[PDB]
Design a protein around this ligand. Sequence first.
Ligand SMILES: [Mg+2]
Lengths: 175, 37, 122, 215
Amino acid sequence: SRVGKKIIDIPSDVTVTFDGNHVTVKGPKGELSRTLNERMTFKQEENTIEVVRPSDSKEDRTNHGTTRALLNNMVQGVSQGYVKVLELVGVGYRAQMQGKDLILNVGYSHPVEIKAEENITFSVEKNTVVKVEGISKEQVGALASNIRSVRPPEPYKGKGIRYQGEYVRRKEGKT
Amino acid sequence: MKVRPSVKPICEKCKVIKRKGKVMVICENPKHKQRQG
Amino acid sequence: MIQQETRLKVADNSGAREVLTIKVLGGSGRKTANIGDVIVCTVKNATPGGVVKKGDVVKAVIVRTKSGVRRNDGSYIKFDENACVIIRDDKGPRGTRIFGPVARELREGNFMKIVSLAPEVL
Amino acid sequence: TKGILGRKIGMTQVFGENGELIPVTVVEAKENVVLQKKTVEVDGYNAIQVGFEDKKAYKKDAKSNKYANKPAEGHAKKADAAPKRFIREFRNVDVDAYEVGQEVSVDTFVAGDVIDVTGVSKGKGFQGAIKRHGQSRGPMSHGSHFHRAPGSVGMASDASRVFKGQKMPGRMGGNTVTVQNLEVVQVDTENKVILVKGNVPGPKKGLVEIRTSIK
RNA sequence: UAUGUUAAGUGGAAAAGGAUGUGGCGUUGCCCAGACAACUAGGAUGUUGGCUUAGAAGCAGCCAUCAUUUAAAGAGUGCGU
RNA sequence: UUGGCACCUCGAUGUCGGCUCAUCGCAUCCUGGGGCUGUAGUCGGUCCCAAGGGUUGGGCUGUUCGCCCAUUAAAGCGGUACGCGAGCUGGGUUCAGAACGUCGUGAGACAGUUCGGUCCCUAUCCGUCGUGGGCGUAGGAAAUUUGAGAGGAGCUGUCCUU
RNA sequence: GGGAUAAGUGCUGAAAGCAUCUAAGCAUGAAGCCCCCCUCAAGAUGAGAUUUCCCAACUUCGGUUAUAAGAUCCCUCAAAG
Ligand SMILES: [Mg+2]
């Protein structure tokens, strides 16, 4: 697991607590607590973390690479943070906030409301560019997928909630 | 989706993967998605 | 209660004098029809001339059955003879001179051209 | 919430506002009393036990259900009430809202409530397939010797038996039936009468249970 | 008991075919001058030059397919009509 | 399905249609959910998941089948002795009568037509649908109950608004 | 209207410093599955629960009468047969 071993972790002014197997990572924007793979061993130097697998058995060399990048995700999201931006394409497609909630008018004869959750913030700009921000990558991604699944892009004119900088295969159907 | 006993690449960009015990093909061309193998 | 093979007098000057019902429209298994229900029918007797000729397969709307209808207040209306009027697929009549009394329950089904053209609506 | 026990008097008709014929059933609900409070910690579930009508007191050498026996008198004397002829219990009600010995009164219902009424249907006795089960009958002419029999009861040697629930002749009626989403038309407090819209199961002078619609 | 294999309830019915499932044995060529990876570093020139074809210059088809600005460069690996 | 074989049954296992009553499979006719589309939308096409419910009435034929007339959201395909005659029918088919064509010298024959032509049985057992008695449930009773389990329901059209 | 799913759609993510719905992990998703709704049900021999009623006097030791509470026989009936 070149991911797991070769690229070691580099905490930057963060507090990681290798509390047995249960790991707890806190920094400027909150605290994250995940339970990593049991068999793996963790070596923590001055502001550096390294993951070591026991055997080179396919399973061990698979959980190693997984649970190194998972901890790297925690430190990078608690020190830097994670953002996902979604563009709304289509005449009359708007996005407005309603207090810890996000309301969309995407041409459905009824507004669609997504309530925010803990550790997650929504924002809007130019009534089109929705923004999801948070510390946990696995939850910001989930929320962004939920918001785009309200109306994913269509192939004939691209209308719909797309990821920003997402290639939309465009067809040329004719009236 | 194509579900057929013969799952093979159709393009150079086609990828053969195994999900949940099934042999599939994923390609950026949606016509080349294939399920069972 | 008009079902298939039921003879009906026609109450207009369209050309048809009697019709037999082939089918009651409105659903699978539908068996009977009352005032305001539309039927398909074959004309069995016609006047010489007129637009409807003997043997034609036409739509008609039922007016004034002898089974009669109940009203929401518990009042019933019954008639002496089953009757029908040939319609033009826009719920509009083919004749111009509807004869005989007509039940008021047709006003709901948007047969307003039939309802207005009848000497008596009851 | 808010159930009650009564007996069916008959059917009649009332004219609503704007004057529509409303077929109604008259239900007489009088001397309803709460006789017990079933509680989770004592019974495993909460309910109120309601007694209805009025038995005569215990007497020596009673020969019919008209007089309460000692078990029933003692049970109804633990609350302060006369022996009752019909005892049911209700789960949809909130037990804390009720108190043992209190009188479930007719005006717990208000006109426009939507109710479920439970009765025992009218008896029909030994009845055949075409009435008990709505089955069609065979031809009445054309040499037919099949008029009101049930049809085949099965297949041939594969099976070699009749499956359970074949819809064969037997005793019709007398079953517990619940009619749903009926509405009370008016309440008469002096006559202690609920007018329910439509018809309810059972013979005249039977027993009906009214309670709030579960839907 | 010892040593291995299988993850499919295979064991406890089938085939042509299809498949980065997985273990064993040998061959073989790339290699710390540093392959294989996206290594987010450049991608173009006279020049589609010639048949240039609906005008079409990585697509309707004969390719003539010349050296490289260059640590590495193809009259364009290649998605395209 | 049409066959092959001749293994059970000739001291009898009634064969086609229809009626009555169903029951199961899913290779799904409709309705529910999807992927791909040479899917602009309404329309479609094809494949995948799904058996919960539903899945028409007539004319002609003994007909199954089929064609046609009108419907329908749809008029699904199969198994159950081509389900079901100790549940019904008896139009076809397969006795005895008669006739036509045809074959035979003839008696007669044809899976060629045509008219006619007895459908028995009081249910012992299992099974099934309903109803009672006995004992049990560690005293003898009256009533009110929980719910382990089991069964039932489960379909869908059109119009208005957006 | 809830819970779990099918086909499917995913998010995070290594095997394979890339990609990747899957291996670990987390979603979402059908008239179908379980519950919800209706009815029956403790012979549920696993025979359940609650409230109430009855409670002695011989024994020569009950293998005990006869009675309580409660039922019935029998009789008048129907909302039931
Ligand atoms: Mg024998």
